[PDB]
Every structure is written in structure tokens, then in C-alpha cells.
Ligand binder design. Structure first.
Ligand code: PLP
Ligand code: PLP
Ligand code: AU
Ligand code: AU
Lengths: 382, 382
């Protein structure tokens, strides 16, 4: 037969979860907040059974249901619905837009250690790619000298995710303001992933660049801060001109969304503050206990604390002392899972060989035991 | 700025609906049955509010929720769940699988007049494409001489949709049995879209080739026969070996489905017969009235009656008499819409210049007026 499936490697992050995610374990690896039950959702976002039952299971539209597009636009695009594309999670948004945006040849600046599919599509589009290093961003700004060197006239796009999954680095309202001007001046397009935007620790929550009305693309999703990764709804905020040029590709992949799923999402974006607040507040209870845990263990673990989001990237000192290979952290994260029922994401997924993703977005009531698992783990090896 | 959106033409079918679909009109253009309300769905498929509310809005899995994969597998894959991939409508299934299946160079046989994205992906994959003509399939079999010529050793895949959207041509259990053997013998992969599979008029409902356990790919969806185009759930039935090789692409596009949407779909596939039966029976009430309407108008309209599905392709004699250009049918379908509030899909979407898609899957209670609209329309021009 001619059944030869094309061999492409799975991205480290997804394959890790596929292989190891399951029940009977203390999971502290997620870059998002722990999910709500659908019960809770109807209660918080105010959804009667009669409103769901009234939904005709018919075709939605290409750009997204008018109701839910209004809800996102108001919050993120300054009322302009024509500038929102609603997608099957922000993943579909990234795929559709970047496909329509990037050409072969163009110079594109991509944040180091970025979530794959954001660096994946420019790499695929055969773009000329120049890395914006991790160390270049500190104290809520990108070294203006590094910005001058990397983003010059001609440059097609600058792709960044802030707050950063997994490190938890982000920008000050000034830092973003500088970056906007740099890209406005060179003609570059700011591509801006705002997945964990709503949870900020050091500075105030960053206003969406897509709200300006300029030549920028920004993404958002109900999956990280909202506690609805399983609703599968995200968006892109960008010029109508681009969004409509994504339709042909949508026509051979997904077509459109469920008006039922849209109904729900519309109410989630309206009652967003109630949804995020309860989870953010909970996550900081966790952050506090983590910081103490960190200082108690500073002989074995070094870290930069998150300036945003609900996950960090602790670095284990023993992997720096041996120094490579990257395969070690995976063995580490495996042994941690087998002996103590505790999950992290090995840093090989984020170009941080010595690091690992520790997420504190989950339930307070352990949480704690994952740490107590890792604590027991770290002592045994030393 | 560098915001130059890549210019790709929208497929005729989708852009037609985008431009012209709306309210205040009699729509008789759909290749599927008219949709259910979510109320009706909970009533028919037996879904209490307490079962929905119990759903944690968390991550589903890559291949699809075990519950809903069982429901499809039992009905379509002979119990084997490992052979089902559940996707955002069959559209995602076609995209994921064909991407993983087709290589550059291979010879692929593609049914004439096929729904775009089925012919789109082999064309994209740079495959060597040879058309299987419309006239080659009649009386529930493909001319065995045409099969001998087109599907020879080496041939990578044969892509077909039966019953055919829009013509409504399909196969006898013998016709499919012949086609299976031809492809089994040459080593070719049968790619088989079974969207409108459950509604058959001339022969019995075609058993799913994916149930054999051989090297075949078959698609299915709750969108055409089930009355749930707005639930956005379809599947592929194929070897686990292929389906798992689609994961990398899913990881940069959609990730997975909603466990809430899966819960619903699981109950829809179990109560499938109740869902289809009420719509099939209704559609045949419509077919009967259409056949009479057809014979009453045989001076202006010629057609082959559907052997399956809920749409046909009537041919208007005036477009054959003038003979081209293809742009005429669109003017026709536009003028029909403007003067009489009646929608069809102009045949330019299916490589049938003189034809137009008339769907009889909609509500009985006009229905009739669309015909009475088209009747009034046809007389005026002659
Ligand atoms: C920054 C970022 N963007 C996007 C995604 C994909 O999520 P979704 O498609 O639910 O928005 C993830 C999940 O790992 C993420 O961390
Ligand atoms: C044969 C066929 N397959 C697939 C589709 C896409 O539908 P879905 O993605 O809902 O399965 C259509 C809709 O026009 C169709 O006619
Ligand atoms: Au990727
Ligand atoms: Au297409």
C-alpha cells in the first residue's frame, strides 16, 4: 500500500502532556488558571437554561458571532467589532493571521523561548528570523539599544508574548509604549500575544495595542486567565483588511464556530472580571507560598519571580553544575513524576535546558503537596 | 508599513454564502438538513441540565474525547475507537489527514466536481492529479473500464464523496465493493467522504469502508444529515498510525475540542437514528413535491434525480442554449435572489457551469415558496 504517514516531530510541550498527563497526580505545570465547571459558569456569567435551549444549531459566520465579537471588541479593541476575529482558541487565530501576514524573505524579530506556534509559522513561511534575547527585557522594558539594532526599517514584524510563558516576564506601560513607537517608526507590525494579559503583578495590566487602531496584531484567549481552556475560544485583534484575507484558509480548515459556544463565550467576556478576579486572587495566595518555598530552597533552586501570569521558570542548580545535555531535565522531570506524583514541564520545551515550568494557577489546597513532593525530591538527590 | 495581506481567492461556495446569505429569504441551497434547536437536542438525545453543568471546562485530548470516540467508532468503525479522530467538523478532519497522507509526486485520482477542500489539499501537496469524470459513475458503479485506467499500481489515493454534493450520485453496495477491491489490489488509499451517507434513496445506506480495518480514510460529520452544522463536529476513520501523525499539525491549529461539545456530540451519535429519521422522512416529502415540480417544468429544466443526500443539481436549458460563459449562472442566481427572495448555489462552485444546487433538506412549509419563486422566475425569462 501507499500509506506512508509524513514524519513530523511533535512540539516538546504537547508531547510531554500527551505522554504523562493524567489522573492520580499533583499537577503544577500549567501556564493558566485551573478550570471552572460549566455549572459555575452559568452561575457567574448569568446563563439560564432557557437561553441555551433557544440556540438554533446553525451556521455561524466567518469572522465570528456578532454578539461575542462585540464582547471582545469592547474590552480589547476599543468597541470596534470589525477588528476582531473569533477563533477555536487563540491557536487558530495565530495560524490564520500569521499565514496571511508573513511572506517569504521578510525579516522578522521573534522573542526568545516563545511558545512554539508563534515562532513556528514565521519559520515555516520562510521568513528571515532574528531572535530577541531573554536578557534584553528586564525592568519592564526591552533594552532600547537592542530594539534599535533588531527592529530597523524594512523589518516585517516583531513577535512577542507578554507576560511570557513560561518565565513570567512582561512590560511596563512605558516599555510597551517604547516598543510601539519603534515598530510604528520602522513600519514593522507588532504581533502581540496577550494570553496571560489580565494577571499582572509588578505593573498595571497592559492595555491592548490592538485598541489603538494601528497596524498591529494582538491575540487573546479564554484559556489561561479565564479558566476556560476547554471552551476553546480565542481571538485576533487586527485590521479588517487582514482578517478577511484569512477567510479562504478558514474555509478549508474549520469554517466557523458553534453559535452555542459563542453564546457562552459572549457572557464570559462580559463577566470577565468576576471570572479572572477569583482566580488571580487565588493564584497570588499561591505565589506568596511559593516565594517563601523558593527562599527556603535557594541552595538548590534559583529563579526570577514572575512579573505577570500564573507560571514561572525555576532553574535547578544541579543541571547548571553538570551543564548540559538538555536531555537531563526530562530525566529529572520524569523521576520527579514517578517517585512523587508531581508534574512540571521540562524546560527543553522553551529553550531553557536547566529550567522547568512551575505553574501556580491551580487549586490552593495543593498546589502545596506538589511543592512538598518537589521538596522531598530535591533533598534526595543532594 | 509592511502590512500586505497575502491575496488568495475565496472558494466560490463560501464567498457566495458570505455575500448573499441572510434573513428575509427562502433558502433552498443547502446540501444538508435544516438544523435543530439546542432544546430539541437535549430532548431527543436525552440530555439533562445536570449532565452539562457537571462538565469541567478543561483540556480534552488530541484524538478526541473517549466517550464521543466510542459513539462514532461503534457506528462507523466497527467498535474500534483507536481508529477515530474527532475534529472541528469534517473540515478539520480533511485538513489534518490529507496533509499527513499526501506527498509531492504521487498520482491521485479525484472525483470530478468535488467539494473544494477535498480537491484542494492534493492540489496543494503538489500531487499528480487525474480526474474521475462525472459520467463514469452511473447505476451505482464506476465504469470498471474507467477504474482500470485511472487506478493502476503506484496510484497513491482515490478521493471521492458519496453521495455526491451537489449532484446526489452514489454507489450500490456492489459498486463500493468493486472500488474497494480495485484500490486494495493496486495499493491505493481510498479516501471516502460520507457526509450525506445516512440518507440513501435508490440503494441501501453504504457501510463505512473504515469499518473493514484496511488502508482507507473515511470522513463523517454531524452537519449534513444530523441537523447539527452548528455543533461543528466531524471525524476521520483511518489507521491509528496516520491519525497520531496528525497531532503535530493539530498542535499549531486547534489543539483539541470542548469536552462540553464532546458531551453533546456523544449523545447525538447514540441517538443518531432519531435525529436523522425525522429529517430524512421530511426531506423525502420534499423530494416527492420536487419531482412533480420538475416534470411540470421539463421544458426549461432538466435534471438527474438524487440517488442520495438532500440536494440535487438541476440544469437550466437556457444556459445550455447560450452555452457559456460560466458567469451567466451567477447573474441568474443573483436575479433570482433579488426579484424573488430565493437562494441557490450557482454551479460554478462545482464545475457545473449550467447547473445550480437545489437543496431540499429544509423545512417543508416552504421549501414550496422557493419553488413558487423559481417557477415565477423561469416563466418571466422565456
Ligand atoms: C502563550 C500561549 N498562547 C496560546 C496557547 C494555546 O492556547 P489557546 O489555543 O487555548 O488560546 C498557549 C497554551 O499553551 C499559550 O501558552
Ligand atoms: C461533502 C462535504 N464535506 C464537508 C463539508 C464541511 O462541513 P463540516 O466541516 O461541517 O463537516 C461540506 C459543507 O459544505 C460538504 O458538503
Ligand atoms: Au510549533
Ligand atoms: Au478549497
Amino acid at each position: 500500500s501507499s500509506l506512508r504517514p509524513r514524519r513530523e516531530d511533535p512540539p516538546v510541550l504537547e508531547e510531554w502532556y500527551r505522554r504523562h498527563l493524567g489522573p492520580d497526580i499533583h499537577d503544577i505545570s500549567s501556564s493558566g488558571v485551573h478550570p471552572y465547571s460549566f455549572a459555575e459558569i452559568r452561575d457567574v456569567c448569568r446563563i439560564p437554561a432557557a437561553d441555551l435551549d433557544a440556540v438554533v444549531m446553525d451556521d455561524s459566520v466567518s469572522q465570528g458571532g456578532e454578539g461575542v465579537r462585540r464582547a471582545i471588541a469592547d474590552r480589547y479593541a476599543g468597541g470596534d467589532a470589525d477588528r476582531v476575529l473569533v477563533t477555536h482558541g487563540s491557536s487558530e487565530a495565530i495560524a490564520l493571521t500569521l499565514n496571511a501576514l508573513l511572506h517569504r524573505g521578510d525579516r522578522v524579530v521573534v522573542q526568545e523561548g516563545i511558545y512554539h506556534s508563534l515562532g513556528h509559522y514565521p519559520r515555516a513561511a520562510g521568513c528571515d528570523v532574528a531572535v530577541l534575547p531573554g536578557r534584553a527585557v528586564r525592568d519592564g522594558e526591552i533594552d532600547p539599544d537592542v530594539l534599535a539594532g533588531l527592529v530597523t526599517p524594512g523589518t516585517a514584524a516583531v513577535i512577542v508574548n507578554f507576560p511570557h510563558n513560561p518565565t513570567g516576564v512582561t512590560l511596563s506601560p512605558q516599555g510597551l509604549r517604547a516598543l510601539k513607537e519603534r515598530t510604528a517608526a520602522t513600519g514593522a507590525v507588532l504581533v502581540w500575544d496577550a494570553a496571560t494579559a489580565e494577571i499582572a503583578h509588578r505593573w498595571e495590566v497592559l492595555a491592548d495595542p490592538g485598541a489603538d487602531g494601528g497596524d498591529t496584531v494582538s491575540y487573546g484567549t479564554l484559556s489561561k486567565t479565564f479558566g476556560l481552556p476547554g471552551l476553546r475560544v480565542g481571538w485576533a485583534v487586527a485590521p479588517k483588511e487582514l482578517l478577511t484575507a484569512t477567510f479562504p484558509l478558514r474555509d478549508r480548515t474549520t469554517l466557523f464556530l458553534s453559535p452555542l459556544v459563542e453564546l457562552v463565550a459572549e457572557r464570559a467576556v462580559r463577566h470577565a472580571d468576576e471570572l479572572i478576579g477569583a482566580r488571580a486572587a487565588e493564584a497570588r495566595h499561591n505565589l506568596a507560598h511559593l516565594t517563601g518555598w523558593m527562599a527556603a530552597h535557594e541552595e538548590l533552586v534559583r529563579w526570577t519571580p514572575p512579573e505577570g501570569g500564573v507560571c514561572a521558570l525555576p532553574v535547578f542548580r544541579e543541571l547548571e553544575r553538570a551543564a548540559a545535555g538538555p536531555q537531563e531535565v526530562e530525566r529529572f522531570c520524569l523521576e520527579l513524576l514517578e517517585r512523587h506524583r508531581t508534574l512540571l514541564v521540562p524546560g527543553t520545551a522553551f529553550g531553557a535546558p536547566h529550567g522547568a515550568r512551575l505553574g501556580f494557577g491551580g487549586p490552593q489546597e495543593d498546589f502545596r503537596a506538589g511543592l512538598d513532593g518537589l521538596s522531598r525530591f530535591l533533598r534526595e538527590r543532594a
